[PDB]
Ligand binder design. Sequence first.
Ligand SMILES: *[C@@H]1O[C@H](CO)[C@@H](O)[C@H](O)[C@H]1NC(C)=O
Ligand SMILES: *[C@@H]1O[C@H](CO)[C@@H](O)[C@H](O)[C@H]1NC(C)=O
Ligand SMILES: *[C@@H]1O[C@H](CO)[C@@H](O)[C@H](O)[C@H]1NC(C)=O
Ligand SMILES: *[C@@H]1O[C@H](CO)[C@@H](O)[C@H](O)[C@H]1NC(C)=O
Ligand SMILES: *[C@@H]1O[C@H](CO)[C@@H](O)[C@H](O)[C@H]1NC(C)=O
Ligand SMILES: *[C@@H]1O[C@H](CO)[C@@H](O)[C@H](O)[C@H]1NC(C)=O
Ligand SMILES: OC[C@H]1O[C@@H](O)[C@H](O)[C@@H](O)[C@H]1O
Ligand SMILES: OC[C@H]1O[C@@H](O)[C@H](O)[C@@H](O)[C@H]1O
Ligand SMILES: OC[C@H]1O[C@@H](O)[C@H](O)[C@@H](O)[C@H]1O
Lengths: 171, 171, 171, 316, 316, 316
Amino acid sequence: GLFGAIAGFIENGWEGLIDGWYGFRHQNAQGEGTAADYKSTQSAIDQITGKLNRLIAKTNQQFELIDNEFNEVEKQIGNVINWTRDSITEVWSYNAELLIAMENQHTIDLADSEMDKLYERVKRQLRENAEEDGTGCFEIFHKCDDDCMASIRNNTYDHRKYREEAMQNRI
Amino acid sequence: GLFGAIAGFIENGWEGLIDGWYGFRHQNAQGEGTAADYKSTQSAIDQITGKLNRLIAKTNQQFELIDNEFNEVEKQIGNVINWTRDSITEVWSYNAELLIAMENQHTIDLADSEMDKLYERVKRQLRENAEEDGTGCFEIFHKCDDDCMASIRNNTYDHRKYREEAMQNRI
Amino acid sequence: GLFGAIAGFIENGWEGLIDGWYGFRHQNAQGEGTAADYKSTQSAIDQITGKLNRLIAKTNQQFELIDNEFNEVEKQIGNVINWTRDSITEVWSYNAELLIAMENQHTIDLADSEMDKLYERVKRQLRENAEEDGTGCFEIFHKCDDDCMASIRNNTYDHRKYREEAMQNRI
Amino acid sequence: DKICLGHHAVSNGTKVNTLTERGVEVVNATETVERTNIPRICSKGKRTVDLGQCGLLGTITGPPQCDQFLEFSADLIIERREGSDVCYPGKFVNEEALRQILRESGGIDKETMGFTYNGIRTNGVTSACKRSGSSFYAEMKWLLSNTDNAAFPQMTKSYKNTRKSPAIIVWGIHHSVSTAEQTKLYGSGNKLVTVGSSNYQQSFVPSPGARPQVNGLSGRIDFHWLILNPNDTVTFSFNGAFIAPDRASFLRGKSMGIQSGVQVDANCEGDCYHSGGTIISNLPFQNIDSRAVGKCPRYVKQRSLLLATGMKNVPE
Amino acid sequence: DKICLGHHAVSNGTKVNTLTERGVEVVNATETVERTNIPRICSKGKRTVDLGQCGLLGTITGPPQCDQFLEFSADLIIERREGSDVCYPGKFVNEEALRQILRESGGIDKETMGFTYNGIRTNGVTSACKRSGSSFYAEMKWLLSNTDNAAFPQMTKSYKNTRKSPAIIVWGIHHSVSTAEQTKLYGSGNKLVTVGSSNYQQSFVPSPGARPQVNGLSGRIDFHWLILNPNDTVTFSFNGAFIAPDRASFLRGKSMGIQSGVQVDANCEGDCYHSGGTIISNLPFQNIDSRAVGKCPRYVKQRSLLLATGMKNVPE
Amino acid sequence: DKICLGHHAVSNGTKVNTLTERGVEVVNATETVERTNIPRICSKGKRTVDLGQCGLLGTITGPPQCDQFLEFSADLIIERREGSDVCYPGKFVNEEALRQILRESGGIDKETMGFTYNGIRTNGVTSACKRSGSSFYAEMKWLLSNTDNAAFPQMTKSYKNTRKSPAIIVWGIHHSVSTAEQTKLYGSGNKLVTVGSSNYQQSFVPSPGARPQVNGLSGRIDFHWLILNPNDTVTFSFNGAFIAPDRASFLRGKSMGIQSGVQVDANCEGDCYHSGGTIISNLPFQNIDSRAVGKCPRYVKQRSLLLATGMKNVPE
Ligand SMILES: *[C@@H]1O[C@H](CO)[C@@H](O)[C@H](O)[C@H]1NC(C)=O
Ligand SMILES: *[C@@H]1O[C@H](CO)[C@@H](O)[C@H](O)[C@H]1NC(C)=O
Ligand SMILES: *[C@@H]1O[C@H](CO)[C@@H](O)[C@H](O)[C@H]1NC(C)=O
Ligand SMILES: *[C@@H]1O[C@H](CO)[C@@H](O)[C@H](O)[C@H]1NC(C)=O
Ligand SMILES: *[C@@H]1O[C@H](CO)[C@@H](O)[C@H](O)[C@H]1NC(C)=O
Ligand SMILES: *[C@@H]1O[C@H](CO)[C@@H](O)[C@H](O)[C@H]1NC(C)=O
Ligand SMILES: OC[C@H]1O[C@@H](O)[C@H](O)[C@@H](O)[C@H]1O
Ligand SMILES: OC[C@H]1O[C@@H](O)[C@H](O)[C@@H](O)[C@H]1O
Ligand SMILES: OC[C@H]1O[C@@H](O)[C@H](O)[C@@H](O)[C@H]1O
């Protein structure tokens, strides 16, 4: 749902990748290499995290019996209580259900978010040196060795270097 | 609200279009033609759908009288009941109101979503062959007949074909 | 959270700017100037606005005593009431907490929204005349005086004028 | 040569509210609060009993009205305003709790408790409980003294719940129009009716005297009741003002009790009732009788709450 | 030559919580739980009655304190801890339900029931109910026997609700300090007070004997009550220990009852009251007295719940 | 030469529901409704009292069973089905309210009320209340007449709450198997027990007669009770059928009362109890006993509600 990346224009996703949530698969000089992006991986994690520490919570509200399991109470008040009780059970069953769906919708669309914010920051690094393949790859129009890959990966990559190269190469 | 497309940079929208939710108006060789995009149209529909089948729901919770329309009950317990009752009526009136706004906000922002995911996939097809007009059109800088339109529409359109043509044409 | 702009690729933000929420800092001919964008500023404001006028609300539901501060009521019914009562206090404390977080999450992600819709409309004006610097600036590759800045600011800026200039300048 | 993206709209759309706005035009929306009633007790499929002129508590005592009902059996039980639990004026002690029981009983099944009587009458009848001529409650017996003023010889009787289900035991105290007249019936002195179950004990002494004519009669018989358990015994110790139960009443099962003023209709089936008819919907919220029973939508105050099923409607 | 977009910030912002974070700095936020009380019953515009030393149930019986109030009329009714429903020790049977009635009555309007008396006293007074000297309840009459030990000739009286509204009928039973002293007043034997309405019957026999001195008097008069309907009749059969009602009391309309310890103030107008003052707000949640009445915000446990009204505050 | 972005997945994931979908595969999710019970009263740290064969109300009266408990002291109080509040058949008037008091008492502390007796017995014992041989309630005294049929000389006693906390005063009425036998014990006539506190008055007359044998005895003693205030006095006026309280009972503090069928366990500490054990969780919702007490998660109907903790799982 939403945002476009996860199950969408990024055509499925990667069982290979086990170092985090997000990452880069490349191919160049040596061949294929895959290395997870810890800042996008920890951004998602640190947000889900914050939900669990809200919902996994210590309700100090105490309640006590009004009721009796062993010598059932007067009939009239007993029926009022169950009513009141069940009237509430409803509310919470509703409240719980809806909470879990609301947050699963946001948990998911939150994941799709952190991916569209990565793709579209690696387009801002790679200026006019490369192009949008369609499904979630850039075409680095010019060679990029396993130190040039690593310069995109740790956000140094100067596009000034290879701009002169790509300028023509891209024709 | 949000996302930018629906009532925003796409300056209003199309009463003409009756084949779905989303679509393409073009002009070329013959002139103007409009054909709805069934995958974006059914993606929105299938998501709204899923809401209705959640809210339009069979609550088996039964409740029975504690109360009496004909010979009103004791005065004391009667006032407790109404209280308890009205205390709840409040809760649900709140709960309902808020549910409907929450989901209308998401229903809407969900629509705006599926449009920004279309515009920005037809930019990924059309590589460096065309440009962002402003309000929701690309300028195909090179002719595209009513079989070339149809190649964008069913996601075949190779940008390699017309790249050579647009390269200069775009100057 | 979400959307990428506010605290993200826009590396922090501007204590200088006091004329609204959003704006443009430039540098050119004369030097630096900052002028707030009232349509994006009022779009955010008009949306938050609409929340407050929902939550700041006149609940006509009346309630009365069932209870007694001065000559405490019978013991049995008294314990039922507190129960019922506290059973509710729970519900609202839950309901309130969750409402405020849900809307603060949307209030925030709503702000990040109106910024990504500005950046990415000033890219649609500036066609192929400029480039994405990385952190939230375009490089107008060609001079833009303090009437050319103002043409982007009030959404006139024709990219046809300076396209010829930027075409080469950008190499 | 060019290409445009966009979305649909319509001539006029439906105004809904969002989290941030009060009244955005959208394409299709649908209503989320049920407003439409049906003025009948939609009873298709269901074993139904419309008591009419019988009042629910009458199905234990057995006045004239409640004759067709002394062993009713049901899925739904409808109660009527016309209906009445008594013939000889008086009332049921701890009334409304009992109805809350019988409404959910699935109907009752009677069994005699087997009391016979040495040295009194077994038979006292009134002009307000009319069968052929003047009669009484069918499940009960007005126990008197043999002739005017004579001895009510102090008695004890007892009934063991044979069955695995609990019973309902009923009996009445007779508040006779005066102390003078309390004699004319039962004889003089402290008139003690005592009632020992086992998970319950208690006693009842009539309070005779003046009180205005109802069905043109100045007396009262009020009925009391207990739930007798599997295996238990009740014991009835008394010396006057006692209406003796012929039969104990057991519950058949499970039922819905409602109260209504509208008629039955076997055509339309429904599970959400109230005194104005039947709430047939699939909507999460109803705005109809906030005491609707059965399996309902939720009551809300709101008349309408429009949920969007389309995008923003934007024309030029 | 270049162009930059961005957003505002400030030196220091306000910490709120989001769905995923506990304390993000944002620009402007506002508080969503009302904490600020006003220590007075903000009563502007409103027809108010501060009972003070009258206790709400006193407005039917009419002790000394409740003299200025026997026909009060109101929008708001304030009850005080100083206040009291009695002069001759005793209490009201089924008390708190009655107050729940009178609080919402809009005030009461009295009418005499028209009982006169052949062959007794009509007038019994006590040193605890002081008017000029020693007096009694104004809406009631201590009915005795003519002289010491003499006959209380068995009586019956009756009042028809003439009006279209329901009434409130009151009466008292006198538990005299001993069986010896029950005679000194009314005469000997089983002292039966009986009370037949029509949608209600019942009886009362005094229980005399020892119980410690309150206002230096060892007796008790406890009051009982019923709601008499349009057209109905109540009937009062008795032979002693009876406090007879002079007047029946009808309800004027609609009112808010509160209980408080703070003073009135006509300057500030408000609709959410409690015993500590007046909750004036437009906020959806209050954290003040969880038994606040009137039209309130919702009680919550939380002291503060900060709702954001700006973006993320990010400085360098 | 190229570069690709993307995200993780797995062989198979966990199905959850979203706002728009019923069952999207996601990577890691976690369960949000507690289902796992512990079949014991997890009581680590806590001053606990398992009454067993004592019934909570027995800790005031003091039957045989409740001997080890007449001054219990506690954080948790466990009640058992085996347990019982009585030896001489009968029951407690207004029972369940009292337990709701004692459960939260933190345990009780006794003090004698100091009644001695001129001209009666002080000592009546039964074969059902067995200590050494046949005995009685320890906190009470069966007050009789000196010899068979003899005078019960009319009495009055009184106890002032010395302390700053409220007390609990108890006493019993004896419903003797017959009027004949009411004499054999106390002597004849209207047997009036009267009970004046100050914020409470009332009286009790035994109703003797037939009712079936329980512990092979056909009589009943039912107990009544009041909360006596700081400074107040209670007064006990009577002439027969009276069980006199030796001691008044004060509350120590604060406790949790539960009812259970499972055993204690000092190993595992917990705050959410019910009759099936102990709900140890940090989950917001439990699906276990909807009458769980203590500090619990919320009951819900749902068995499982899976909350997502990862992205969409998409493989090829
Ligand atoms: C209230 O609920 C419990 C069990 O859920 C049941 O056993 C109890 O008797 C109920 N009471 C009535 C009268 O329905
Ligand atoms: C409780 O609510 C009903 C329905 O609105 C009302 O008619 C009834 O009399 C209420 N009870 C009291 C005592 O106000
Ligand atoms: C119910 O609530 C209030 C809490 O402020 C308390 O003082 C009152 O006495 C409670 N009732 C009982 C029976 O404890
Ligand atoms: C009831 O009592 C009988 C007496 O013969 C006994 O055999 C049986 O176990 C009991 N059964 C039930 C269901 O109460
Ligand atoms: C009350 O009784 C009188 C008898 O004179 C009658 O005329 C009137 O219609 C009755 N009913 C009502 C509702 O006022
Ligand atoms: C209780 O009575 C005594 C009399 O000796 C008195 O001095 C004291 O103030 C009273 N009240 C309390 C709460 O101690
Ligand atoms: O029902 C009321 C009246 O009915 C008459 O037929 C009867 O003869 C009268 O004694 C009186 O009882
Ligand atoms: O009020 C209590 C006391 O007051 C005295 O004035 C009166 O003479 C006494 O008889 C006693 O009643
Ligand atoms: O089970 C009760 C019976 O036990 C006997 O031992 C006793 O002598 C009888 O009087 C009777 O009390």
